[PDB]
């Protein structure tokens, strides 16, 4: 009788302490981020340290992790504005749900990929990097972002072929570590990745980039823009055209986060700026 009230007092001191740690974590920095490979819906049976405070997610959601509560539970938040911190199930917790189910029944994809804390921005299109039309249109966008997001942004040139991140292998792995590091302070990261012309080239990496498709809708327009640069550039018209066609054949919702098909620079810039400001709010709660 009076020992059932001792059991309840045990549960709720434990909840009070977990709650306290949760309150404190609000102002702690983000330690790392994950991209989810699975979905999770909180349920009473999961034994949340503070009931009502579990974080539910779908596959391909992003989580900011601040710290560990115990081996079953981390503390963090979904990367979404309005979403404040709560309890995230550890990879051990999620595997033990399966394992528990299997050990009782008898009677390999990790649930998380570690990703940069700020997804880095990679621009692809309108055609091949290394030729003038593509290099100059992208440069104008890089110049815009450096000004609009002064104080909140790191822009970096990546010359290494980081598509090989699924001698060189050393340089590539080094560039991946540097990108993770730039992102750790929660500034916007923007890559000028010289070797990346197609979203598939970064698929197997764990950069989880925001892919920006700078799209010239009309092939005739691109054809004339290239020729407008003269014979040296016009000599390589063919490689540029197929590079552009390949991008246009990508399934959009699967391949791209942002598509800039505006023919005026200011409109393309403001479309991109809107997206990145929304991403900033998602990654920077007022909590």
């Amino acid at each position: 009788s009076s020992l059932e009230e001792d059991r309840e007092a045990v549960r709720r001191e434990a909840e009070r302490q977990a709650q306290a740690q949760l309150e404190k974590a609000k102002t702690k920095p983000v330690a790392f981020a994950v991209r989810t490979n699975v979905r999770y819906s909180a349920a009473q049976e999961d034994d949340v340290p503070v009931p009502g405070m579990a974080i539910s997610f779908e596959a391909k959601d992003f989580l900011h992790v601040k710290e560990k509560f115990n081996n079953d539970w981390w503390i963090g938040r979904l990367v979404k504005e309005g979403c404040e911190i709560g309890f995230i199930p550890s990879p051990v917790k999620l595997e033990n749900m399966r394992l528990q189910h299997e050990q009782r029944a008898k009677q390999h994809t990790p649930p998380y990929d570690v990703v940069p804390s700020m997804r880095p921005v990679v621009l692809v299109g309108p055609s091949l990097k290394g030729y003038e039309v593509t290099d100059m249109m992208q440069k104008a966008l890089f110049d815009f972002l450096k000004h609009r997001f002064e104080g909140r942004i790191s822009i970096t040139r990546v010359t290494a072929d980081i598509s090989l991140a699924k001698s060189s292998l050393a340089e590539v792995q080094s560039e991946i570590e540097r990108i993770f590091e730039l992102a750790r302070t929660l500034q916007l990261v923007v890559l000028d990745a010289d070797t990346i012309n197609h979203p598939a080239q970064l698929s197997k990496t764990s950069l989880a980039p925001i892919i920006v498709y700078v799209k010239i809708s009309s092939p005739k327009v691109l054809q004339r823009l290239i020729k407008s640069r003269g014979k040296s550039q016009a000599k390589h018209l063919n490689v540029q055209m197929v590079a552009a066609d390949k991008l246009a054949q990508c399934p959009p919702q699967e391949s791209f986060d942002v598509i800039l098909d505006e023919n005026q620079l200011e409109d393309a810039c403001e479309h991109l700026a809107d997206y990145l400001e929304a991403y900033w709010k998602a990654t920077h709660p007022p909590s």
Partner: peptide
């Protein structure tokens, strides 16, 4: 004038800003 000439001039101006 055509949509194509318009797009073209948009992107030619875009490119001049990088010069």
């Amino acid at each position: 004038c055509s949509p194509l000439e318009c797009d073209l001039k948009g992107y030619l101006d875009w490119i001049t800003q990088a010069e």
